Design a protein around this ligand. Sequence first.
Ligand SMILES: O=C(Oc1c(Br)cc(Br)cc1CNC(=O)c1ccccc1[N+](=O)[O-])c1ccccc1
Ligand SMILES: O=C(Oc1c(Br)cc(Br)cc1CNC(=O)c1ccccc1[N+](=O)[O-])c1ccccc1
Lengths: 166, 166
Amino acid sequence: LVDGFLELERSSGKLEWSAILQKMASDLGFSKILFGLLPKDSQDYENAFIVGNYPAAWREHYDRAGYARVDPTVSHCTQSVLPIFWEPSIYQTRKQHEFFEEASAAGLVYGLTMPLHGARGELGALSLSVEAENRAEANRFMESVLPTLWMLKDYALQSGAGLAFE
Amino acid sequence: LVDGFLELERSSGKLEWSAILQKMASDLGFSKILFGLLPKDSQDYENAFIVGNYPAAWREHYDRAGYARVDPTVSHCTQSVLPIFWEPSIYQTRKQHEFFEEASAAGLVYGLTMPLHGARGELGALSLSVEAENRAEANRFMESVLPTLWMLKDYALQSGAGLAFE
Ligand SMILES: O=C(Oc1c(Br)cc(Br)cc1CNC(=O)c1ccccc1[N+](=O)[O-])c1ccccc1
Ligand SMILES: O=C(Oc1c(Br)cc(Br)cc1CNC(=O)c1ccccc1[N+](=O)[O-])c1ccccc1
């Protein structure tokens, strides 16, 4: 993990940094990731530093639909430092239901979001999806790697913030 | 850990919450802790919300000597979300050397500080010291529990920010 952080901090460019972070997620056993970060006092959710390998057409749709205002992981990130697991119970509103359905059609069904709060007031999220036969298998996988992930998100936040905002 | 968090969340008052957080640290192998938290925007280190079992007279001395402007873990917390271990190389200025020597006379020589950055802009530190026979042993210990500690500091922040400012 620390060697991963060192590779992140020796990377030259957004593309390289993204490739290293994706590989670190993938080595941990996740399949898709999205690292998103805004500068301090921005909720300008389109003009964020966004990196990872979610389907391009899903990312476009998420912006066009205004899903930053619906996605329950986003409001959760504004209120907590703790992870929020993509459980059926987090989708409550009708819009949140439609969100779940469309993300699911995008292959994003099981996973978690780690909120990111940087030392200069950066606000973000690291979301990671997992391929699994069922939610039970998914949840067990995520519990087995949660301590590594919890360290990873802070190493990603610290390196990423310097890359995004220099 | 999560049970520990749920206990913190069910607790009433600063006293019970302290006792729970101290026991969680002690169970993990650390003898002394300080959990320190400021509201958004404050740089008022002497009126920080403070919990733990550091010797009272060391806390008094820190306040009276203005060590918040000296203590190298404090500048680090303002810049980073990553832990900072109490290695001799972090003490660089003459005043920093005096601070190392005085902290050490208090029994606070081996340890680390986890920066705390909350979702409403709270700024803090969870410092934990370890009673070991020497620094080599303390560092072995701390490496072996680091991933638990890294999740712990965030649960403590999420619960304790409520306790401090809500
Ligand atoms: O990255 C952020 O949000 C974004 C941005 Br923007 C674009 C996109 Br696409 C996605 C997110 C975060 N949500 C998720 O990853 C997520 C969560 C639960 C179920 C399904 C999804 N999903 O998208 O498949 C973000 C940045 C700063 C602050 C808060 C959020
Ligand atoms: O609590 C904070 O700082 C405080 C406050 Br105030 C009072 C006191 Br006493 C201590 C700290 C934090 N330093 C340490 O724990 C520390 C670090 C390295 C070696 C020795 C010690 N030590 O003190 O024995 C704090 C709060 C917000 C942001 C940064 C720091």
